Design a protein around this ligand. Structure first.
Ligand SMILES: [Cl-]
Ligand SMILES: [Cl-]
Ligand code: NA
Lengths: 215, 213
């Protein structure tokens, strides 16, 4: 398959420089696309690496540099001074032949720009009670609070409990730290019979927490 | 730049339905229009180029139509793998601008949420904060309003929410809202309430507790 392979996840501070890469293996042009978290696709610009002719979307002109090294079939997107608002996924796209534009896409490079620093989560119980019980069903969970950067993984009972589990998307707090909840609905008669443990892994901080959640 | 308008922003459909979604360009772009599919956590995939040409490997239930300013993407018989977000993009004039996307979600009947409230843990209070979590479980459609009240005072600026992707089994959504206060602020108030508004409820549902009760 013709494919475009992008460079890995980036976590940067405001004012840092950054250069990300897009390599073709198996296009006479490469485009760049921004997708901010929870938002749609935005066209940034294009380069023809044969002679490095570039064009920028007026929104991106002077905000980023597109470049290429034809000798190694690689294109780049470079910032001299990152902003928090540069937090996004970046995709490169190209054309596997002369008739089908944008048929090849890179897998995307996730870039986080924040003043926050690497931090493992606090894992708090969301205890089942009468305030979380509805006709024989109880809800319980874990609040996975104040971590940076994404992502975290959550399982229940080491992956044995999957039915009725809702693990929410994280929210970014005004502190610059993420928070997410994971909940499960269970028979209220199981409380006190079945142990419920949320297994939390935050690889960026090497944090692993197993939190027992009891009534 | 060319403005691309997609309609609708989201639509609900059943497996086997014929689904159309529209894309308008702010000037004629002839037949220079691509359609993409995107699923959560994945790169966009080209379905259709030149307004009506199927990309290799795309199922023949997908078709495109239109020329000039007004374009459509039709799925003749919607399959479970087709619930996704769709984008159009003009390929005529740089910059090659995108539409804002149309999400195709699964249609089901209205389902009221089950509402659960969770007081802060002693572990968190010792650490200096108080989070109160309001869970709206397994409802439809996605639109819901959660209001926090502390001693019957409406809160602003101190809560955040997020919603799950539609469950592929029962086609419902769930929503978590977190009210976060300082430990000092939490200790000054008695009654913590989340008030839920949803199409499935004939009137708002309040779940509440009294601090230390
Ligand atoms: Cl088909
Ligand atoms: Cl765009
Ligand atoms: Na046509």
């Amino acid at each position: 398959q013709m494919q475009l392979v992008q460079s890995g996840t980036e976590v940067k501070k405001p004012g840092e420089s950054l250069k990300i890469s897009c390599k073709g293996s198996g296009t006479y042009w490469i485009g760049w696309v921004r997708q901010m978290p929870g938002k749609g696709l935005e066209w940034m610009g294009i380069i023809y690496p044969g002679d490095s002719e570039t064009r920028y979307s007026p929104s991106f002109q002077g905000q980023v540099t597109i470049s290429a090294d034809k000798s190694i079939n690689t294109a780049y997107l470079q910032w001299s001074s990152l902003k928090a608002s540069d937090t996004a996924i970046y995709y490169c796209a190209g054309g596997s032949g002369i008739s089908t534009p944008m048929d090849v896409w890179g897998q995307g490079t996730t870039v986080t720009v924040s003043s926050a620093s690497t931090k493992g989560p606090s894992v708090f119980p969301l205890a089942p009670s009468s305030k979380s019980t509805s006709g024989g069903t109880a809800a319980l969970g874990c609040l996975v609070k104040d971590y940076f950067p994404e992502p975290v993984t959550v399982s229940w009972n080491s992956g044995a409990l999957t039915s009725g589990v809702h693990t929410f998307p994280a929210v970014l707090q005004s502190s610059g730290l993420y928070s997410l909840s994971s909940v499960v609905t269970v028979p209220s008669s199981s409380l006190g019979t079945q142990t419920y443990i949320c297994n939390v892994n935050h690889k960026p901080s090497n944090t692993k927490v197993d939190k027992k959640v009891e009534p | 730049d060319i403005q691309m308008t997609q309609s609708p922003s989201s639509l609900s459909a059943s497996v086997g339905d014929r689904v159309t979604i529209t894309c308008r360009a702010s000037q004629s772009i002839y037949s220079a229009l691509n359609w993409y599919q995107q699923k959560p956590g994945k790169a966009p995939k080209l379905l259709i180029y030149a307004a009506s040409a199927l990309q290799s490997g795309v199922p023949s239930r997908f078709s495109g139509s239109g020329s000039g300013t007004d374009f459509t993407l039709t799925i003749s018989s919607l399959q479970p793998e087709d619930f996704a977000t769709y984008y159009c993009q003009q390929t005529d004039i740089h910059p090659y601008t995108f539409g804002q996307g149309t999400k195709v979600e699964i249609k089901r009947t209205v389902a009221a949420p089950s509402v659960f409230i969770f007081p802060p843990s002693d572990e968190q209070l010792k650490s200096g904060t108080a989070s109160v979590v309001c869970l709206l479980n397994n409802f439809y459609p996605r639109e819901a309003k959660v209001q926090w009240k502390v001693d019957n005072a409406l809160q602003s600026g101190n809560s955040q929410e997020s919603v799950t992707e539609q469950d592929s089994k029962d086609s419902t959504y769930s929503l978590s809202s977190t009210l976060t206060l300082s430990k000092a602020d939490y200790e000054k108030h008695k009654v913590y309430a989340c008030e839920v508004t949803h199409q499935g409820l004939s009137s708002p549902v309040t779940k509440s507790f009294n601090r230390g009760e």
